[PDB]
Amino acid sequence: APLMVKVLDAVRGSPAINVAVHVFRKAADDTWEPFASGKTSESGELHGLTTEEEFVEGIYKVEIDTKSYWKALGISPFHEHAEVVFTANDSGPRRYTIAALLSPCSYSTTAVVTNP
Amino acid sequence: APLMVKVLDAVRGSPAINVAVHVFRKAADDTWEPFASGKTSESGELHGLTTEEEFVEGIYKVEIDTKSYWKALGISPFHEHAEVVFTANDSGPRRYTIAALLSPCSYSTTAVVTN
Amino acid sequence: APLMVKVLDAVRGSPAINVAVHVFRKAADDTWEPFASGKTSESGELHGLTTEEEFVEGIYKVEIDTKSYWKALGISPFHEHAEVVFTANDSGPRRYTIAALLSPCSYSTTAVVTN
Amino acid sequence: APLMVKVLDAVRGSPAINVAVHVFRKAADDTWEPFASGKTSESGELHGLTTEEEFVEGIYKVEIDTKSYWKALGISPFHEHAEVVFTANDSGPRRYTIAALLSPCSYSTTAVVTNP
């Protein structure tokens, strides 16, 4: 897991399951290029997004589709999604976890970065 | 007032209104001495808790009755209450705001200390 | 003003002052149209961004320049910026406050919507 | 892990290591009785606090010693500790994770509850 995403639900006190996540990388021409995507498991985790070789230096955007999540639960939330943008691997390879906590009108995100 | 409390509701996206709050100060024997209390306003704020003269250095506890708040909304919450415990320290002019953000199974709190 | 932004610093326990904020509205072609911008005040607030007349229903993006903020404090942060994206919906009288709490490697945001 | 504690550091973007945690249970006479204690590992996790048999119904308090944590790092924080109080196992046994995110002037806590 060079790149992992973990999402919790603050209303249910449980993992946020079936959350769609799209990752983008900024291209040489300054637009967002699709990089990888997936959905969280029953444990609220999303592995297998990429590999060390493909996860090169760059500016990455991790979009967590919180609206589609609350909508699938029949709830009316506020945010379109939770967007996490960061430079990665500019000092060599690292392993990144993006952790997120969701409520209908609020979210928090945190990064855990470790050296392999 | 050197001490103020602000409470927000992360589910409804608004202030948390009519939430009971109890403040205590740690006594010499390590027990919690009632210090001040009230209910948050329409703005989720609790003003006039204390004065400069009464608010001396020491350890204080701010107890927020989150359980009753959630129950009144028809929701079963996790925590019995939310407790914020900190040291008040003279080291320049100061006003303490204890902010809290509530969800049924989570809460966050931050201290905003200004001159 | 139906839109206001409040920013706090979880490390120093105080408002985040002089932080650049840019607001954008989603255009028909799905691009982000500059809408309003400014720097937070001594209270960590950004008032007078827009008016009722200009603030119509739609999708808006609030971009907070957290990277420059941390760099000015001598700290290397994780995020390039903090982006808050939401739909403004008429469904009664409303005032939107977008609150954000910043740490070098984390941020949280809540919408406080009142009548 | 009937009871687990996980703690992250929002300044370093890493697990909060060597964090002391004390757990108490309210006794019949309404005072806080020591129940278990430990410190977080290099992964910021604390397992082995108790067993299903010993973790009976009751009101529990999980105290995370954030002051001793920031002090050990030579930092001046605000909170004495992060205190998490909850009723557990009143509908039969559950597995509880208390997750916490720490900054010098702020903390957030979340509960994840699952049925074994």
From Swiss-Prot, chains B, C:
Further remarks about this protein from its record: Tetramer dissociation and partial unfolding leads to the formation of aggregates and amyloid fibrils. Small molecules that occupy at least one of the thyroid hormone binding sites stabilize the tetramer, and thereby stabilize the native state and protect against misfolding and the formation of amyloid fibrils. Two binding sites for thyroxine are located in the channel. Less than 1% of plasma prealbumin molecules are normally involved in thyroxine transport. L-thyroxine binds to the transthyretin by an order of magnitude stronger than does the triiodo-L-thyronine. Thyroxine-binding globulin is the major carrier protein for thyroid hormones in man.
Reported impact of T110M: In Chicago variant
Result of altering L101M: Loss of tetramerization
Family: Belongs to the transthyretin family.
Subunit composition and interactions: Homotetramer. Dimer of dimers. In the homotetramer, subunits assemble around a central channel that can accommodate two ligand molecules. Interacts with RBP4.
Record gene name: TTR
Gene Ontology molecular functions: hormone activity; hormone binding; identical protein binding; molecular sequestering activity; protein-containing complex binding
Effect recorded for I64V: In AMYLD1; amyloid polyneuropathy
Name of the protein described by the UniProt record: Transthyretin
A biological process from GO: retinoid metabolic process
Effect caused by changing P15S: In AMYLD1; amyloid polyneuropathy
Phenotypic consequence of E45K: In AMYLD1; early-onset amyloid polyneuropathy
Function text: Thyroid hormone-binding protein. Probably transports thyroxine from the bloodstream to the brain.
Effect of E80Q: In AMYLD1; amyloid polyneuropathy and cardiomyopathy
Outcome, altering S68Y: In AMYLD1; amyloid polyneuropathy
Post-translational modification: Not glycosylated under normal conditions. Following unfolding, caused for example by variant AMYLD1 'Gly-38', the cryptic Asn-89 site is exposed and glycosylated by STT3B-containing OST complex, leading to its degradation by the ER-associated degradation (ERAD) pathway.
Result of changing E80K: In AMYLD1; amyloid polyneuropathy
Keywords per UniProt: Amyloid, Amyloidosis, Cytoplasm, Disease variant, Gamma-carboxyglutamic acid, Glycoprotein, Hormone, Neuropathy, Phosphoprotein, Secreted, Signal, Sulfation, Thyroid hormone, Transport
Impact upon substituting F78M: Loss of tetramerization
Annotated effect of mutating L49H: In AMYLD1; amyloid polyneuropathy
Modified residues (4-carboxyglutamate): E33
Outcome of swapping G38A: In AMYLD1; amyloid polyneuropathy
Disease as annotated in the protein's UniProt record: Amyloidosis, hereditary systemic 1: A form of hereditary systemic amyloidosis, a disorder characterized by amyloid deposition in multiple tissues resulting in a wide clinical spectrum. AMYLD1 is an autosomal dominant form due to transthyretin amyloid deposition. Protein fibrils can form in different tissues leading to amyloid polyneuropathies, amyloidotic cardiomyopathy, carpal tunnel syndrome, systemic senile amyloidosis. The disease includes leptomeningeal amyloidosis that is characterized by primary involvement of the central nervous system.
Primary location group: secreted
